[PDB]
Write a protein that binds this ligand. Structure first.
Ligand code: HEM
Ligand code: HEM
Ligand SMILES: Nc1cccc(CCc2cccc(OCc3ccc4ccc(N)nc4c3)c2)n1
Ligand SMILES: Nc1cccc(CCc2cccc(OCc3ccc4ccc(N)nc4c3)c2)n1
Ligand SMILES: [Cl-]
Ligand SMILES: [Cl-]
Lengths: 362, 362
């Protein structure tokens, strides 16, 4: 019964995709080719053009993403030909290098072979390709708490972290048929990191903060016309609040606001002093300043929201419905200073899209 | 058919209300009294105790309110005995005075006669009892744009504003049978206002900003057991972001961020400088400082969110379901610094509650 669902999704996807591509006349023959292929094989194989456009549609449909103005310029790398661990590893390394682009971040996705009959071909364990390890024992907190479970999984497989606050996790992924994942240390020459300084407050460097250049989300499933690409890591560039208001600020993450308050010279005693708010602003100013100073792409939430307004206008001009998730679109810093905060959005799910999938570990 | 709906609402309300009040045994006889009363009269009349508790329940059920920890200490003033304009006006004046309480704001509601058969007895036109007028002609912007339509309505009735940025609108309300509302200037001796200064930046007073002490929301309908109290003005104290992040900051309100940036000495040129965020923080620090300096109650969003966490815990301990509206509960300043931002809430509507109703004017 698997193939009846697939056929329906493929009809809807091919019709819409060829329509947008001006190939509506070719729709008829391509679907017949598909229906034969499914009857014979149980599945079908996207053309390069369909795979590229489908990945772009999926970004355009991601309700939670403010960055969607640039959906059509996604650089799609087709790695459905991969068969071995070395090829997976090298394609992951290449993604890091080409997406980094010496700091001028190129929004990129690398697509690996899709699930066959819901059996995975490649299974990536990382949440992002570049991310810091986290440790918790004997009351000692080190690194990124969000990474505790994966870090413990990795250290069961014979990896061992230096237990700095910024250990790079290795790539870790499992191949079909294999029964433990392999892991590979990231070559440091491929990983750009940005030290956090402040434009005005020289003491800010006493915090010794840093973050990595490129967030490469490697654990979501791309669904295009009924085909499930569970391994399809992608990246944009950061919006600064993601680092300054969440990764470095959350009490469950690096929890740095009290130390930020101290180095910027304000007291952290009274809610009514709004010291957390003031610290959040200076930390977020430092993040943008540091990325720009180093020549690594980044966008602030005001410019990002302005770009998203253009996306909304572009949708309307193209007669496409806009969908969005207000609770994820508003930024966590001065949200009411953006137009997003002041309108509502239809949170309907349209496909192609990116979806969550269960982690292979605990 | 009006009375069948009423009977159902009354059963649900009286059962729940007497239950909470430990009067469950009295439920039976009180409902029979109600069913006779509705058969005869078309409606029923709440006891003082039911009206007071029902107003308190309605606040407890207001999904959008972060201030609900204090729902049970609401001071309920029963003015169902009012019949004339002078009595309405004096009860509105008394509400201002007793709720203000020389600055130690007392959360208060004044309840006027309810709708009879959906015909209103008293119809308040003000959105808040104390609010500033707004004007727009010939490209000239004065006052509070949110008040433009009511201000124009008032000036049709023979009132005339001085056209400062902070003219107090008069009370305006209509009595049943009458065909134009009356209006009365507020006695300035009853209206506390707070000039906005900054704790550290003496130049902040050059902005000549002020706001009024007590927000007294006078245009929502209180519904208790099927009875519709359309005229039931109530007040809490302000949460500082309401003034500093919305009333004085919104581009459609007083739009003061560029002037705030100037007096605090930062440039307002580059999104990446986060000058809007920085200005928002200093303006909101000034609002809290000024209310506290003058001795007028106010709460900051951090303390408010801490209190709301206690409300959530109190609900759970009492076996009551919690409902809430996340998009209204998070504050517009540093929302992710509060626990609210990090959980979800059931937005179901339970009654008693406060509801929107159409304005009598345009
Ligand atoms: C080019 C620069 C980009 C920026 C600045 C950007 C910004 C963001 C931000 C800030 C979020 C999280 C919002 C929040 O935490 O509330 C987000 C979510 C998302 N973005 Fe983007 N994004 C960009 C590129 C991309 C790309 C290239 C894709 C895929 C091709 C993508 C797909 C998504 C998805 C799927 C989510 C939601 C993930 C989830 O539900 O967990 N974005 N984006
Ligand atoms: C005692 C101090 C109080 C504080 C600090 C407080 C705080 C707030 C705030 C900040 C909002 C708007 C949230 C936003 O803009 O997103 C709000 C909404 C609300 N509050 Fe409270 N509140 C308090 C007292 C009261 C009282 C006494 C009542 C009624 C008895 C009430 C009923 C409501 C209602 C009904 C709304 C939503 C109004 C609407 O939908 O337009 N609150 N509250
Ligand atoms: N309590 C709360 C309220 C609203 C929203 C949220 C989400 C916070 C969060 C947590 C973990 C991840 C995350 O984002 C994932 C993501 C995916 C794709 C991206 C592409 C580009 C980019 N720059 N960022 C991306 C981030 C958000 N939590
Ligand atoms: N785009 C957006 C997103 C989320 C929430 C909002 C609401 C902004 C708003 C507009 C007008 C009024 C308002 O609040 C009304 C209100 C009612 C009762 C109160 C009791 C006490 C108190 N201190 N404040 C109250 C405020 C909120 N807009
Ligand atoms: Cl991240
Ligand atoms: Cl207000």
């Amino acid at each position: 019964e698997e193939k009846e669902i697939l056929w329906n999704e493929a009809k809807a996807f091919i019709a819409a995709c060829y329509q947008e591509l001006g190939k509506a006349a070719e729709v008829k023959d391509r679907l017949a080719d598909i229906k034969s292929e499914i009857d014979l094989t149980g599945s079908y194989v996207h053309t390069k053009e369909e795979l590229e456009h489908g990945a772009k549609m999926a970004w355009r449909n991601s309700n939670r993403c403010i960055g969607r103005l640039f959906w059509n310029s996604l650089n799609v790398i087709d790695r459905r030909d991969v068969r071995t661990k070395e090829e997976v590893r090298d394609a992951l390394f290449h993604h890091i290098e080409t997406a980094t682009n010496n700091g001028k971040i190129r929004p990129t996705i690398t697509i690996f072979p899709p699930e066959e009959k819901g059996e995975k071909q490649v299974e990536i364990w990382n949440h992002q390709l570049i991310r810091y390890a986290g440790y918790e024992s004997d009351g000692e907190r080190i690194g990124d708490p969000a990474s505790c479970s994966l870090t413990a999984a990795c250290e069961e497989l014979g990896w061992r972290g230096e237990r700095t606050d910024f250990d790079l996790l290795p790539l870790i992924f499992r191949m079909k048929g294999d029964e433990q994942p392999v892991w590979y240390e990231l070559p440091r020459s491929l990983v750009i990191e940005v030290p956090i300084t402040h434009p005005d407050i020289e003491a800010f460097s006493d915090l010794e903060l840093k973050w990595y250049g490129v967030p490469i989300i490697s654990d979501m499933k791309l669904e295009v016309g009924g085909i499930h690409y569970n391994a399809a890591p992608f990246n944009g560039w950061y919006m600064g609040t993601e680092i300054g208001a969440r990764n470095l600020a959350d009490e469950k993450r690096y929890d740095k606001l009290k130390k930020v308050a101290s180095v910027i010279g304000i007291a952290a005693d009274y809610n009514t002093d709004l010291w957390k708010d003031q610290a959040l602003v200076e930390l977020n100013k430092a993040v943008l300043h540091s990325y720009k100073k180093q020549g690594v792409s980044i966008v602030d939430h005001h410019t990002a929201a302005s770009q998203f307004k253009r996306f909304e206008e572009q949708a309307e001009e193209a007669g496409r419905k806009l969908t969005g998730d207000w609770t994820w679109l508003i930024p966590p810093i001065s949200p009411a200073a953006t137009h997003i905060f002041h309108r509502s959005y239809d949170n309907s799910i349209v496909k192609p899209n990116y979806f969550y999938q269960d982690k292979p570990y605990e």
